[PDB]
């Protein structure tokens, strides 16, 4: 069980690998600020109609 | 060389707009990064202006 748990932490380590990939996504993230405001702007127009 | 000058000057305008966007979003650290990209584009644009004057 203990050695299998050490093997299970290979999946946990793989989760941090996706987190480092996401780090590049944090530099790219400014596009999400314009994307999020845009969907609320047309949604506000749709609600006002 | 005059085309490269117009490309790097409109790229500097794009980065200035990204800096403005970062400051309204409170991300002053990204505004400084954008200003650093703007500075390297205006400094290379001055090198292209010099090249163009000789040409």
PDB file of C-alpha atoms in Angstrom, chain B residues 18-28 31:
ATOM      1  CA  UNK B  18      -2.598  46.797 -23.287  1.00  0.00           C
ATOM      2  CA  UNK B  19      -0.897  48.977 -20.614  1.00  0.00           C
ATOM      3  CA  UNK B  20      -4.094  51.127 -20.313  1.00  0.00           C
ATOM      4  CA  UNK B  21      -6.166  47.905 -20.008  1.00  0.00           C
ATOM      5  CA  UNK B  22      -3.798  46.535 -17.308  1.00  0.00           C
ATOM      6  CA  UNK B  23      -4.084  49.787 -15.256  1.00  0.00           C
ATOM      7  CA  UNK B  24      -7.951  49.773 -15.373  1.00  0.00           C
ATOM      8  CA  UNK B  25      -7.781  46.074 -14.252  1.00  0.00           C
ATOM      9  CA  UNK B  26      -5.367  47.068 -11.361  1.00  0.00           C
ATOM     10  CA  UNK B  27      -2.505  44.902 -12.830  1.00  0.00           C
ATOM     11  CA  UNK B  28       0.274  47.566 -12.593  1.00  0.00           C
ATOM     12  CA  UNK B  31       1.392  47.706 -17.300  1.00  0.00           C
TER      13      UNK B  31
END
